[PDB]
Each structure stands twice: as structure tokens, then as C-alpha cells.
Motif scaffolding. Sequence first.
Motif, PDB file in Angstrom:
ATOM      1  N   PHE A   1       0.825  -1.199   0.000  1.00  0.00           N
ATOM      2  CA  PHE A   1       0.000   0.000   0.000  1.00  0.00           C
ATOM      3  C   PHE A   1       0.862   1.254   0.000  1.00  0.00           C
ATOM      4  N   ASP A   2       2.176   1.096   0.170  1.00  0.00           N
ATOM      5  CA  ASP A   2       3.085   2.232   0.087  1.00  0.00           C
ATOM      6  C   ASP A   2       3.231   2.743  -1.338  1.00  0.00           C
TER       7      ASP A   2
ATOM      8  N   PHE B   1      -0.508   4.755  -1.518  1.00  0.00           N
ATOM      9  CA  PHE B   1      -0.767   5.935  -0.699  1.00  0.00           C
ATOM     10  C   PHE B   1       0.391   6.922  -0.761  1.00  0.00           C
ATOM     11  N   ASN B   2       1.621   6.416  -0.860  1.00  0.00           N
ATOM     12  CA  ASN B   2       2.816   7.253  -0.828  1.00  0.00           C
ATOM     13  C   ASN B   2       3.387   7.523  -2.214  1.00  0.00           C
TER      14      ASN B   2
ATOM     15  N   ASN C   1      -1.060   7.199   8.889  1.00  0.00           N
ATOM     16  CA  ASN C   1       0.243   7.846   8.812  1.00  0.00           C
ATOM     17  C   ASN C   1       0.242   8.940   7.753  1.00  0.00           C
TER      18      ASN C   1
END
Lengths: 596, 195
Positions: free
Chosen positions: B6-7, B10-11, B38
Motif C-alpha cells: 500500500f506504500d 498511498f505514498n 500515517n
Amino acid sequence: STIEEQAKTFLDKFNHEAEDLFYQSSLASWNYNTNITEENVQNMNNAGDKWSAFLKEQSTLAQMYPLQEIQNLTVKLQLQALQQNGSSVLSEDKSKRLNTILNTMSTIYSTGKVCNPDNPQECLLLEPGLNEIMANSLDYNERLWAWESWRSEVGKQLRPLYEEYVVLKNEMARANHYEDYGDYWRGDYEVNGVDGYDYSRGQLIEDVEHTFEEIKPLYEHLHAYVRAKLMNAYPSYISPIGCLPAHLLGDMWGRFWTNLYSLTVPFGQKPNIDVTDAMVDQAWDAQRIFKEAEKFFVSVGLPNMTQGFWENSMLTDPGNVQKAVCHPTAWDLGKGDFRILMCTKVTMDDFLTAHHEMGHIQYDMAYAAQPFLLRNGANEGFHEAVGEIMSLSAATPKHLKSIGLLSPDFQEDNETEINFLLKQALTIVGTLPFTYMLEKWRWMVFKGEIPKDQWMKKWWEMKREIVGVVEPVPHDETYCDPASLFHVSNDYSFIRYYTRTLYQFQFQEALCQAAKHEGPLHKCDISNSTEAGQKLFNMLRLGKSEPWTLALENVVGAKNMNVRPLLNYFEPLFTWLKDQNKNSFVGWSTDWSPYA
Amino acid sequence: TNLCPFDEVFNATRFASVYAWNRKRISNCVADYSVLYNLAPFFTFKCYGVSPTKLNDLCFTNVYADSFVIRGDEVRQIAPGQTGNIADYNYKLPDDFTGCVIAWNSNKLDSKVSGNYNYLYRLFRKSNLKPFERDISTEIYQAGNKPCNGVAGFNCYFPLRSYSFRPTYGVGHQPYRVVVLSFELLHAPATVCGP
Ligand SMILES: *[C@@H]1O[C@H](CO)[C@@H](O[C@@H]2O[C@H](CO)[C@@H](O)[C@H](O)[C@H]2NC(C)=O)[C@H](O)[C@H]1NC(C)=O
Ligand SMILES: *[C@@H]1O[C@H](CO)[C@@H](O)[C@H](O)[C@H]1NC(C)=O
Ligand SMILES: *[C@@H]1O[C@H](CO)[C@@H](O)[C@H](O)[C@H]1NC(C)=O
Ligand SMILES: *[C@@H]1O[C@H](CO)[C@@H](O)[C@H](O)[C@H]1NC(C)=O
Ligand SMILES: *[C@@H]1O[C@H](CO)[C@@H](O)[C@H](O)[C@H]1NC(C)=O
Ligand SMILES: *[C@@H]1O[C@H](CO)[C@@H](O)[C@H](O)[C@H]1NC(C)=O
Ligand SMILES: *[C@@H]1O[C@H](CO)[C@@H](O)[C@H](O)[C@H]1NC(C)=O
Ligand SMILES: [Zn+2]
């Protein structure tokens, strides 16, 4: 597809593009106004030229949709606001001629120098030179000399320019399917296509004259009192039945009479309410004042202010190298950007100005959800009236004591209310006859009922019969006395100052009715009255979508401008003036002149 | 312990336009929805059909992550049974949608002083979008009765427009990054839950 769907699609496109371009132009203008540099000047000029070109192109493109086949009365309003063929109707030569003429008018008015006799070097402008002289100096000779010098040096140059301006504006008005330029000006209040709310361009004159006829007795009683006080001040220059002199009206043109207060105070032993020293003692600064204003506006149920308002708006003078115009304004840049430009000082006047521009900002935030062409006041009078009512409410002794500014041991006695009412009347009541006279004279000049060679010949009968002012020196056709005013020289309508006066008092009585105020109206307060806040917001959120008659009825229940609240506001003052003037002549004569 | 990223969703250093939203397939995973808080005060985290309250203990066949950027006012339109430009012409969710929607502000990244014209959206279309449909065609919209002939003109408009983000805009006009997680249960081993 029908024409209506095409119009809706085109309006969506125009809304998007116009929103973007208007935001860019407004941001450039704000950067210029808060930072006076030549690069900012050129950026503002480029942005304005781009916005004007876009607006003209979109108006030309929208001209291809005839108005008749669009229903829903909302798309039709936007199309009407967009088409607006304007001065472009005439030939390009006439358009550039009018641009040059108006530019010369503005240049002459802005750069008007008056030089004292025997020394062509101590010359002065309107500000701050002659304004201080006409607002503070009480010398008869100096005021008369300034009056004559301004009416002789400035108007004469503007007279042929004014004549050409009038002729070509009449040409534009006739080319735009109007009777005259006065009809074009009055077309703002026109409402069509709604049953029970239609308004005609000819109804405005009837309403204005009808309201002034009822206002007349109070102004006449005030004029008699001011004449008696001026007699006590100038025993050798005013006739017992003659009119007041032009240059003894407190300022250059006689528009406002506040400057006579120090001369016309009835009870000078009772000081007025001044809390500036109180704010000095508590070390109040600008941000504290604006926080207090926001608290007042929240107390009536209105929402918060955006964080961008605190981050971006400049609430204090920068001094040092950064130069900016210190005129207090409220800016709505669009896309959720609201700012206030104000050089705040520690003064009760600035304390009320903060509330005034805060009300402007709240009104701007109210209709942010309307389409781009419908984000304005319902007419030209509601916006400033909504601004003014908050300043009226915030200045009462009750509100000052509620925030700790005034000591609790301050007990009101009727001398203070009499002084306050006289101070208010010297500004509000005094300007109504002047506004009505100027608007009526301009309407007759544009209509053609007043012949050219008899302009000034006519101009001075109204001054004796409507406002009751007699000139100190006769003026022939060479002078142009009206053009000495900023508004007419810059081609701005003047009736918006009248209706606004009759609006801010119709709102307040309604608003105070929601707060269940008991007692005199002039001591009212709308704080902690969430019902009144909702009642006002229901009208503020409309914008230009609905007719102004419907918006007015939404708050006061009436579809027409009414003057009864204004007279109810000054009722104790009216009784006091009647009692004081029972032993004095009431009225004036139009035959006496100070120059005999 | 196979944790799929998921990084990368989302990132991501850059997101996609709303009309060209990015769809990513996620499977054979240890799905840890527990650690997702986060981000800078992420305003919206709303789940439909499945309870957000620690109901991550359920095994799904596949997961889709759809990422895009909109403005603050249209975040409400990313929901079942909504009407608007985004809900009709750009990105449509089914009435029986099951999944989650996560939206967080992105002013500090996607806004530029001179304007961010990279992000686009669709303004005109012949008909609404079916659920989970995408349209990329740039053929100019015809509003009148005359053929457009592929040239902009009267009653012939380019269907795509630009947000043009700036840092001085209001909260409702500031960029927001949106990620939509869609869960399927099929006739399959359904090997995506994770402890
Ligand atoms: C409006 O309401 C506010 C809050 O209800 C009032 O502020 C309080 O007024 C009381 C009255 O004596 C004081 O004792 C409190 O110290 C005030 N502050 C609080 C409670 O935080 C305010 O006075 C009201 N104003 C008007 C004009 O009614
Ligand atoms: C005002 O303008 C000058 C020169 O253009 C610039 O140096 C200065 O930073 C500006 N001030 C602000 C607050 O932007
Ligand atoms: C008028 O048009 C607007 C769209 O701009 C629509 O929302 C409204 O329902 C229309 N009114 C009528 C009476 O059709
Ligand atoms: C100006 O615009 C109006 C409104 O569209 C139109 O009726 C009129 O014919 C136009 N005049 C010229 C000279 O284009
Ligand atoms: C914003 O307004 C609400 C009431 O509408 C109030 O409770 C809140 O305190 C205000 N915000 C601040 C920072 O005071
Ligand atoms: C104020 O009220 C007192 C009490 O009746 C009265 O005697 C006095 O004349 C009033 N003052 C004015 C200016 O009316
Ligand atoms: C994004 O990166 C930060 C640290 O750079 C991390 O704390 C956060 O968990 C990451 N996002 C996700 C969804 O894992
Ligand atoms: Zn104002």
C-alpha cells in the motif's frame, strides 16, 4: 437540442474560464495595491487587459443567442448580464473619443491645483490641502475664497467636456434601446418576468419623490436649528428667512454636515462616548479588534473566518519601504479567497470600520455558491446597507459594556442620546436632500427638459427649494459647479447613496424585531440573536438570483422601499427639535442672497 | 509474512487525473489495514458495506485500489448514489458498493504559485458513466446540430478542462488525493486476508 441546453452548456464553459481569469486579475490587483512597484503596475495592466478581452469576446459570442426562447428566468438573467453590448455599439472613433474625454475628466479632477493669490507656489490639492481647510478652518473669507477658486478653476475646463460627454452618453443610451442615459442608470432596479414583483424604470422616480416628501419636515426642522446655530456663530452673514450659505456647510460641496457638530452641539458639557483610551489601557492591537469583530459576528450564528483570511490579509500598515494605499477595502478574489486591506489604528473609528468590512466579507461569503454572473448584491444598495447595519449595532453603549471596553458605572442620561441622535442626523439626514437634488438635476439634464443655455439658470432654484442653500457668488454658464464633485466627474451613479439610507433602517427594525429588543430603536443590539442571524442569512445567501423586491420582502415583508423606520429611528430627536424650534421660524425663502 | 505495497499507492510521488484514475490489482497478500493512519490529518475515511471497526479479519479474493486527485468540494461525490460532474462523467461508483474511500488533503504538494495545470477533468459527455467505467477519448463534444469536424468553435467544445490549483485557494478549492479500495468475494480460494 433546443437553444436552452446550448445556453446552459455555454454558461458552464464561461463560468469556468471567467472564474479562473477573474481570480488571476484580482490577485494581480491585490499585489499591486499592497505593494506599489512598477512591475506590479505592469502585471495589473496585463491582467486587466486579458480579462477585458476575454469578457468582450464572450459577450460577442453570447450575443448569438436570442433571449426570448430561454425559460427558467435564471439562464435569461445570466445571458442578459453577459450580452451588455455597451459603448461598443457606437463607432470606434466615438468610443475612443469617450475614453479620452473620461480620461481627461479624471486627470483634471485628480490633478486640480489651487494656488493662493500673490504666490503661485503654495498650491494645494483636494487632499490633504483643501480638505483640511474646508473641514477645520472656520474663517469666512478663506472658505469663500476656496469655494470660488475651485468653482472657477476646475469647472470651466470641464464644461465643454461635460457637454460632449452628455451628448454622446445620450447617443449610447438611444442606441441601447433606452429613453436617455438616466433611464440606462435606472435600469438597474428593473425587474421583469416575475408576477407580483415587476418593477418599472419609471417607478423609481415616483418612489424617491414620495419618500422625500415625507422626509421633508424633519430635514426642514434640522435646517432651522442649524440656521439658528450658524446665526449664533455668524451673526452678520445669514438672513432670518434666507437660505444657508454654500461655504458654511462644513465641507467643500455641502454633501455632509458633520463638521458643524463642534459648532452645533446642544450640550457641550457632556462628553461623547469615546473608548479609544480604554483600548489603549488594555493595549488593544489590530488583531484583537478583528477577533472581537469575529466574535460579534459568530454570536449571531454566522460562520467562522477562513484561515486564509488571517494568513493573507494585511491588517496593519507596513511602514518602512513597503508603500500601499491605506483605503480600507474588502477583497473577494474568488475561489474561497477573502482578504481585508486596512491600515488599522487604535481608534474607535477603526473599531467600527473593522465591523463594517467584516460585514462586507460576510456578505461576500454568503453567496459564494451562486454562479459567476450572479455573485453580487440584489441591487446597488443592499451591499453597503448590510455593511452599515453591523457598524450601527456594534457602536451602542450596551455592546461596548458587554466587551469590557466601557466601565460598568456608565449610566445613560437623555442628554447623551440627544447628542448622539443629533450627531447621527448631521450625517444621515443632511445628505438626503443633496442626493435627491443632484440625481433629479442630472435626470433632467439627460432627459433634455433642461435647455443647454439654462443649465446653471435652473441649477440654483432647486438648491433653494430642495436643500435650501443659496450661493455666495453668482455663477454664469462659464462655470461648471456640479463637475467639482468626484462622482459626476468620474461618471458614477449617485442614487445608490439614497436607497441605501432607506434600506439600513428597514433591516435594523426587522432585525431588532427578531431579538425582541425593548425600548428605543437607536439603543438596539442584535448580538446573541441567532434567529436574527438566520433571518439575515436567508437573504444574504440569495445573491443576484432573485429579484431585489423578493429579497427585501424576505427580511422586512415589504416589496418597496419604505421610510417609516428611518423616521421612527429619529422620533425622540424629532420631538426635541420641535420643542426647541417652537420659538423660531420654520422654512426658508428662495429670494434672499448673501451677495444681495 | 508477504506484505504487498500500500506504500506504492498511498505514498506515490504523483497521482493520476480523475478522468484517468489509476486502477491497481492486489492479491496473494497479508492485508494489513490496521496501520494506515500515517498521513497528515486525513479528513475522510469512510467504508460502505464492511465495518471499519477491526473487521479486517475476513478473506477476500482480490482488492482494487483506485487513485486520483480532485478538489475539496467534490469529495462528497465519491460515494454510492451521488450526482455531479465527477459522479457522472469521470468516476461512478455502484449503488451496492462495498469497500472503503480514503481522502486526504494535498495542498502542500499539488499546489503551485503559478498554477498546477497537470490535473484535468471531464466537463462534457453524451451520457453518464456506468459503474467502474473509464473514458479517455478526447473527441470534442457536439452541443449543436452541425458537425464539429474535429475543430473547436461554436457549440463545439473540448471536453477536458483543468483544475489549475494554487496555494492561496480556499479549503473547498484545494487539491485532495482520493484512494478507493474495492473488495471482491468470488468462487475462488480467496487468499487475501492476512492476520
Ligand atoms: C452575549 O452572550 C455572551 C455569552 O452568553 C455574553 O457574554 C457573557 O456575558 C455575561 C453577562 O454578565 C458575563 O458575566 C460573562 O462573563 C460573559 N462571557 C462569557 C459567559 O463567556 C454577552 O454579554 C452577551 N451580550 C449581549 C449583548 O447580550
Ligand atoms: C514588495 O515589493 C518589493 C519589490 O517588488 C519586494 O522586494 C518585497 O518583498 C515586496 N513585499 C512583499 C511583502 O511581498
Ligand atoms: C433552471 O436551471 C437550473 C440549472 O442551471 C436547474 O437546477 C433548475 O431546476 C432550473 N429550473 C427550472 C424551473 O427548470
Ligand atoms: C448590441 O447587442 C445587442 C444585444 O445582443 C443587440 O440587440 C444589438 O443589435 C447589438 N448592436 C450592435 C451594433 O451590434
Ligand atoms: C467557529 O464558530 C463556532 C460556532 O459556529 C464556534 O464554536 C468556534 O469556537 C469558532 N471557532 C473558533 C476558533 O473560535
Ligand atoms: C431628560 O429627562 C428629564 C426627566 O424627565 C427631563 O427633565 C429633561 O428635560 C430631559 N432632557 C431632555 C434633553 O429632554
Ligand atoms: C508512507 O510513508 C510513511 C513514512 O515515509 C509511513 O509512515 C506510512 O506508513 C506510509 N504509508 C503507508 C500507507 O504505509
Ligand atoms: Zn463599505
